[PDB]
Amino acid sequence: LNVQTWSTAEGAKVLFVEARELPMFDLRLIFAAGSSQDGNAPGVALLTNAMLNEGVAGKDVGAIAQGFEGLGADFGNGAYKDMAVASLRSLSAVDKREPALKLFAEVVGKPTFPADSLARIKNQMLAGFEYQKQNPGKLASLELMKRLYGTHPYAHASDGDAKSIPPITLAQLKAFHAKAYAAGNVVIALVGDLSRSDAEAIAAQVSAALPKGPALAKIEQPAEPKASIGHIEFPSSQTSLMLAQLGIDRDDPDYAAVSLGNQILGGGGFGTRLMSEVREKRGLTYGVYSGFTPMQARGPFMINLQTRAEMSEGTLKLVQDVFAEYLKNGPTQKELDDAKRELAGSASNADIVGQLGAMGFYNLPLSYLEDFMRQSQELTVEQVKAAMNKHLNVDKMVIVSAGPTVAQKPLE
Amino acid sequence: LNVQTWSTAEGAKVLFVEARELPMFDLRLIFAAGSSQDGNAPGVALLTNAMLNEGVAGKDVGAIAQGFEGLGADFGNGAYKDMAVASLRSLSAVDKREPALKLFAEVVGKPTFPADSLARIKNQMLAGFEYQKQNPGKLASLELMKRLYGTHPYAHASDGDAKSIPPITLAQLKAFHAKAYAAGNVVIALVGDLSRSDAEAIAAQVSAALPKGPALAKIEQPAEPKASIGHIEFPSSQTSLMLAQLGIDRDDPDYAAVSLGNQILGGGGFGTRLMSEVREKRGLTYGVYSGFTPMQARGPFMINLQTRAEMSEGTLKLVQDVFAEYLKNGPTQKELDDAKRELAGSSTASNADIVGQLGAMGFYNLPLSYLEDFMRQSQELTVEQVKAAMNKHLNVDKMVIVSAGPTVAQKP
């Protein structure tokens, strides 16, 4: 496709793809306003993002939702470690998109942050922390990110904690919003039934409604953690196991190589090394997965699965052996091909706008999409093995288990 | 507003509301195909409903998904206790809705139940059962529904269990579908940018694509269970509390009165009696809710919350006292007005909200003027009428209580 890009007067990065198949369009705003920008107030980024559509001049939470619905539009939001998102899907018809866009602009650019909404959202978050202590996987991953990142901004939970949420004030949210939702801190992605002229108008309108400000400081790289094995005691006949170490950052040149290499190890299914060895041949789990989560700074590489508590010790060694062998010998030409073929089979405005968001946010080449498919079928078994060994090491894994401490049964 | 109704040549009940504001419409099919129809194969209803869009003649799961997406349409499905649904939201333009409806009819009326999809679904359902036992609330809920309904079809979990899922064959899914998804067993609800003639054609087309057959017989009423208290030992840190007894069936005349009474007792908000006493004044929980789940047969009335294990013994007594006190004196004028005001707020209804009500109207044989009657009646209820209704359907001596948590010393 023909990806077009430019910047607004306020400094926003714009990426656009014209798609006339459907009388609709997707607008996605990506801000460098993830939890990594939390500073001394864990949870403030997530709280700010969740509060956007709780109120604007003249409209309470209900009226805003009704506003979008009545116009045939869908609003979406979310906060993560690197970014925070605000999105709109709407009919392309001028009479529908105009009021939808002005409302969207008001919600993301001029939220009023109603006091009652804040109290309600905090309560939901506090209740959430309580339910979380009943989810082994959630506890294991939280522990795992702490051991992996230490004091780095990516270490703390995005939603903060019971201690940090209560003190957050409306003033802190307004201050964070003014700084992190600034035009110079955003990427405007558009895909749909629009001309480049309409796209420019839309992007400019959004950019002008946002608070004025420069981009925030980028996140530094984390220090490599030391290998370790932790355990979280939890009642259940099952045990959640997670293994991880630092992976790559989104802009790393070996992205295509490590992603294909990962597909073979623990991607979707039955065919992978892990699913066949752990699930297919031994029936020790209903699902085992592996994957990289590239961010601005080095993201984590993780392997996760659940098994019967009495088989956990044995299954862990098995996963470690499978991983060790894979890094040592790499993939077979047969696995690589099936991997490329599988990939060859994997677009809507939504899927595209999502990619444009990452392309602009991580400053990837305009040709990113094509470059990825192209680089990916070109890769040889030797390039994949080299890339995996360059970014992963068997002696760097941080392991966290969550389940009961019970007698262990060796694998049969 | 101006609900229109008729039946198709197959005996399907059709309900339609013309709404021309947006160039789209919502089609919802409600089948008497919930878990209550499981018989000797718990979970077959949910599995059949989940397999609908997994494949049709010459098309796999991904092909069907892209098919709807490329047309700007969304497919929806879900199975419950007394009903199973299949829905489609689509642009109204003929060039988009015609292809989308043909695909939709094929998906719901002629599913192929691919072998590889059934294995994938069973695998995730089996994984689901494992996750479930690590959840106190779910464990208490399953047990509570058992004590409440005994051998009644509503007692067992809709998704079946680890022992009932593996055995389910394609032959069973095929037979269940031919019986439960028969045209005579479905309600067709339509709302949107369509003329009555457009709607007639759409309904006739969907109805004709379904298997031919009559409506299934209605489920009998459950027996009044004896009051009892049960505890599920779970060494986790918080305690889950659930109280319940048989509520009303969906077409009960006091529906509006009990809905408003329940809203005041434990609906949404911090103003309810339960949230005020347990959370507001005592700070014993982050969320306590109560509610009726009216079904074809008597649905349950349930109250649920989570508290610190050491406060569970006292909190349960408090909730019971608050409940007794509420049935005894009824709601205050203030509570009644606030509730009516909240209800009123909560010609602005969207196609999705309307289509949902139309489906229930048709499935439960509610009066054609149900919508208008609900508003009128609700806004006119008196404290005396609400108190009478709640007392007519609930009794403090009939509560079945089930808690899940650790047995620890009480700190009150």
Domain boundaries, chain A: 4-216, 218-411
CA distance to partner chain A, nearest, from residue B318 (Å): 20
Interface of A with B in 179-238 (CB under 8 A): 234-238
CA distance to partner chain A, nearest, from residue B31 (Å): 27
Contact of A98 with A199, CB cutoff 8 Å: no
Contact call for A22 and B91, based on CB within 8 A? yes
CA distance to partner chain B, nearest, from residue A75 (Å): 15
Q: Do domains B4-216 and B218-412 have the same CATH topology?
A: yes
HEC profile of chain A:
CCCEEEECCCCCEEEEEECCCCCEEEEEEEECCCHHHCCCCCCHHHHHHHHHHHEECCEEHHHHHHHHHHCCCEEEEEECCCCEEEEEEEECCHHHHHHHHHHHHHHHHCCCCCHHHHHHHHHHHHHHHHHHCCCHHHHHHHHHHHHHHCCCCCCCCCCCCCCCCCCCCHHHHHHHHHHHCCHHHEEEEEEECCCHHHHHHHHHHHHHHCCCCCCCCCCCCCCCCCCEEEEEECCCCEEEEEEEEECCECCCCCHHHHHHHHHHHHCCCCCCHHHHHHHHCCCCCCCEEEEECCECCCCEEEEEEEEEHHHHHHHHHHHHHHHHHHHHHCCCHHHHHHHHHHHHCCCCHHHHHHHHHHHHHCCCCCCHHHHHHHHHHHCCHHHHHHHHHHHCCHHHCEEEEEECCCCCCCCC
CA distance to partner chain A, nearest, from residue B328 (Å): 30
Residues 6+ apart with CB under 8 A from A398: A144, A147, A148, A225, A227, A228, A229, A243, A244, A245
- Chain A residue whose CA is closest to B73: A22
Q: Experimental technique used?
A: X-ray
Contact call for B236 and A133, based on CB within 8 A? yes
Neighbours of A362 (CB within 10 A): 18
* Nearest Cα residue to B338 out of B281, B386, B301, B288: B386
Contact call for B23 and A91, based on CB within 8 A? yes
User: Which chain A residues touch B127 with a CB distance below 8 Å?
Assistant: 286-287, 306
Contact call for B23 and A23, based on CB within 8 A? yes
Please name the helix (run of DSSP H) or strand (run of DSSP E) that holds residue B238, with its range, or none. strand B238-246
User: Which chain B residues touch A129 with a CB distance below 8 Å?
Assistant: none
**CATH topology for A4-216?**
Cytochrome Bc1 Complex; Chain A, domain 1 (3.30.830)
**Data resolution in angstroms:** 1.9
Question: Among partner residues B71, B127, B133, which is closest to A237 by beta-carbon distance?
Answer: B133
Mutate to test the interface with B, among A21, A130, A343 (most CBs of B within 10 A): A130
Contact call for A235 and B235, based on CB within 8 A? yes
Mutate to test the interface with B, among A97, A286, A307 (most CBs of B within 10 A): A286
User: Which chain B residues touch A23 with a CB distance below 8 Å?
Assistant: 23, 72, 91, 93
Question: Among partner residues B72, B237, B287, which is closest to A127 by beta-carbon distance?
Answer: B287
**How many Å apart are CA B203 and CA B200, to the nearest integer?**
5
Please name the helix (run of DSSP H) or strand (run of DSSP E) that holds residue B31, with its range, or none. strand B24-31
Q: Which residues pair with B290 in a beta bridge?
A: B303
Q: Does A286 touch chain B (CB under 8 A)?
A: yes
- Chain B residue whose CA is closest to A72: B22
**How many Å apart are CA B326 and CA B340, to the nearest integer?**
18
Question: Among partner residues B124, B126, B234, which is closest to A235 by beta-carbon distance?
Answer: B234
User: Which chain B residues touch A91 with a CB distance below 8 Å?
Assistant: 22-23
Question: Among partner residues A119, A130, A238, which is closest to B306 by beta-carbon distance?
Answer: A130
Query: Which option is the CATH number for A218-411: 3.30.830.10, 1.20.1740.10, 3.40.640.10, 3.30.360.10?
Result: 3.30.830.10
Contact call for B126 and A286, based on CB within 8 A? yes
Query: Which option is the CATH number for B218-412: 3.40.50.300, 2.60.120.330, 3.30.830.10, 3.10.20.520?
Result: 3.30.830.10
